[PDB]
Design a protein around this ligand. Structure first.
Ligand SMILES: [Ca+2]
Length: 223
């Protein structure tokens, strides 16, 4: 997260870190045994880390649970990043509490102008590289489809939306991938892609979660 703020320990209780020896992606806990992340975060040997603030220090509220299976969306295209969504099942159910909690799926799609919270442990520089140990947060509005398409001609599908600031300086970034965009207590987006980070006229692009609710529910119900 570039141009954000320190969230505060366990203030984003649905935020998870995906770990394969090191943090490589974010995710969102949507019930006691399932996480939603980006399909481009797919790999084998995933451990889900819940209750994290400083990802380099054991602070006492963590739960570390290995993934038993991952399910990438059947229509994911890694070239265009269309359908950039995946489900991860935990080997055992997380113990839910005030600091480890699920986030509700949308019942309807959020509109342009809606304020959302974007969070993660990604790069905090738009030019350099600096990775924070503690969770970073950014409040950002969803942008109009027209402005999103104008920023990225030929690249925005019906399964994507832009959020952030056309002026630049405030954005998600490398390492935030797969993490949450939550608006009015609903998971509306997943950190997917963008050109650099926090660049003028290149806002963050996010997977449009409301398009996938039926798939998520049906997949969870049979797996
Ligand atoms: Ca920790």
């Amino acid at each position: 997260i570039v141009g954000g703020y320190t969230c505060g320990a366990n203030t984003v209780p649905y935020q998870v870190s995906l770990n394969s020896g090191y943090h490589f992606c974010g995710g969102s806990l949507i019930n006691s045994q399932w996480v939603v992340s980006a399909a481009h975060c797919y790999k084998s040997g995933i451990q889900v880390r819940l209750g994290e603030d400083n990802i380099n220090v054991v602070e006492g509220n963590e739960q570390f649970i290995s993934a038993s299976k991952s399910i990438v969306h059947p229509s994911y295209n890694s070239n265009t990043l269309n359908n950039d969504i995946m489900l991860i099942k935990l080997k055992s159910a997380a113990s839910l509490n005030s600091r480890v909690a699920s986030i509700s799926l949308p019942t309807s799609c959020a509109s342009a102008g809606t304020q959302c919270l974007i969070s993660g442990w990604g790069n905090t520089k738009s030019s350099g590289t600096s990775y924070p140990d503690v969770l970073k947060c950014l409040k950002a509005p969803i942008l109009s489809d027209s402005s999103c398409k104008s920023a990225y001609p030929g690249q925005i599908t019906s399964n994507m939306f832009c959020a952030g600031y056309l002026e630049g300086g405030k954005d998600s970034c490398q390492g935030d991938s797969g993490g949450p965009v939550v608006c009015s207590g609903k998971l509306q987006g997943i950190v997917s892609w963008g050109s650099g980070c926090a660049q003028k006229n290149k806002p963050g692009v996010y997977t449009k979660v409301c398009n996938y609710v039926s798939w998520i529910k049906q997949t969870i119900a049979s797996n």
